[PDB]
Design a binder for this molecule. Sequence first.
Ligand code: DPM
Length: 318
Amino acid sequence: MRVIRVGTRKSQLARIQTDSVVATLKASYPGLQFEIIAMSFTKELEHALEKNEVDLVVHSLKDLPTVLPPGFTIGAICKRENPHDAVVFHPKFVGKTLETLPEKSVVGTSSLRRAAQLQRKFPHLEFRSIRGNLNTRLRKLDEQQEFSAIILATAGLQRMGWHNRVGQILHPEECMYAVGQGALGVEVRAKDQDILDLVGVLHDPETLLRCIAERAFLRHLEGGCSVPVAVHTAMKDGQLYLTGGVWSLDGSDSIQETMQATIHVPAQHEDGPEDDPQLVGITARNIPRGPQLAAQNLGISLANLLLSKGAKNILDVA
Ligand SMILES: *Cc1[nH]c(Cc2[nH]cc(CCC(=O)O)c2CC(=O)O)c(CCC(=O)O)c1CC(=O)O
């Protein structure tokens, strides 16, 4: 291990996320060299990995499928940033909330998850698609009179240093977040033991266990980034709490349930067996396997409860 090559997309937010992970790595490894390789969507970065052109890539965890191709794996789940959804208001509406926008105000979001939940909670608002990156959406907000607000992840605006645009942070009772939102995943070659060990230092046990549950829930519902599925996780008092929900496209039909499981957060790293398979695409051999399997099982458990109440028919057309 000499120069650790980090591959990144050329987009602004992808670079910020990569730099943050590289800074954390450097703090654990001041004696190693890190190179950031920017290339001109996940299959192209996975190609560089497979061609040994880079050694690791940084993703928003919610953008990664629950099944990765067999030669790759998530070698690190970083300490979660703020997972909650946020509202940016049109300039004339600074200081308002969703509750106090005038009736028929148009709210911009291209997430089925966000639109379905907010339509349910706010019947008197209109939710409409809006395309573009964060800068483009904010430009269409401020330059035009079409949108009265847009919905975005709090974590994205924070990484841009634009927290001053956040006008409202949505509570779970208004809009539960996407599976993996606010956490970064580090993708690596599944068989590159040296690099898996290196990035393992980034694993945050609490976030790892929360995200295994969230992803196992999503996987067992056969969902991905695109579906109206939402979650809320918390680790308190030796319990892992997982809330999960599914919504019809307009939010009028929904199923939402909570489960918990006794799972203590590991406080120490351990030399785990190298022959255990990944869990929902994540490899964490330096973290005890017991709690990891238990988190996966909790997410499967909740998924089966939702399916028992009809979640599959909801998702099939949504
Ligand atoms: C699965 C999915 N991806 C995105 C776009 C995206 N990916 C990451 C972020 C920043 C927050 C994070 O790292 O977790 C974002 C942008 C954002 O959420 O603000 C979306 C949202 C698409 C959209 O039109 O806003 C989704 C679907 C979803 O979140 O429900």
